Design a protein around this nucleic acid. Structure first.
Lengths: 122, 122
RNA sequence: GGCGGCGGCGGCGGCGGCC
RNA sequence: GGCGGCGGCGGCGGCGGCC
């Protein structure tokens, strides 16, 4: 299936995750998890994120309105399907959801939600 | 139970809702729905909202960090419980969730989420 | 980080019902 | 707007298991 994502997955191995745990804390993870769900299908990413401008800029590029619409439209037809973006970072999860007819607005809110969460006060 | 909310509920009657439907469209409802959930308990509000500054200011006052913490803390103890804010307006729902230890951060994201959604481009 | 399992609570979407 | 019902998909939180 074609992904809504434009960067590949970066899930740490169990060993990398242990090492990072040994050397740091839920407020300083390796990165964050995000997902786009259209109908019955879900696409997932773990992306490394270090709370700098360069890093925020990188991870904001993991999907766009267009990449999302291209992916989701594979699943469209007459009836409306449920669409969901979810992001989790530092113990907070934000999910943005609605029906496919409102996908443009869900993307707009999803991107703002992502930026606000990834810049939230330490 | 003590509510996290500081404004009373404004749910339209079935007749008011029909009349409003006859005279207007999912992009122009009477208002929006919001909820705060702590453990097993959920508190809900429908609030009238007309997309003006005065109205946005009013409905942003429906809860605060303090009102939320006072309400939620009734349900606290040793073990962490799940906390959730949900808001729905114009076909988009945003839910902010995490555990009670992170309640301050959930509130910060919940208030931003509320403002962004209620000001979203028509 | 990932994958099962057992409780609990939310959310979206479809279909219909009562009001 | 509210309340049932029947599919589907997600989220949080608790408890434990494998890795």
């Amino acid at each position: 299936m074609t992904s809504p994502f434009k960067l590949p997955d970066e899930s740490p191995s169990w060993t990398e995750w242990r090492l990072h745990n040994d050397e740091t804390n839920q407020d300083n993870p390796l990165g964050f998890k995000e997902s786009w769900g259209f109908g019955k299908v879900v696409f997932k990413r773990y992306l490394r994120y270090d709370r700098t401008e360069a890093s925020l800029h990188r991870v904001l590029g993991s999907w766009t309105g267009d990449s999302v619409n291209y992916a989701a439209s594979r699943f469209f037809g007459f009836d409306q399907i449920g669409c969901t973006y979810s992001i989790r970072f530092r113990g907070v999860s934000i999910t943005v959801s609605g029906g496919s007819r409102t996908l443009q607005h869900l993307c707009e809110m999803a991107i703002r939600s992502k930026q606000e969460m990834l810049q939230m006060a330490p």
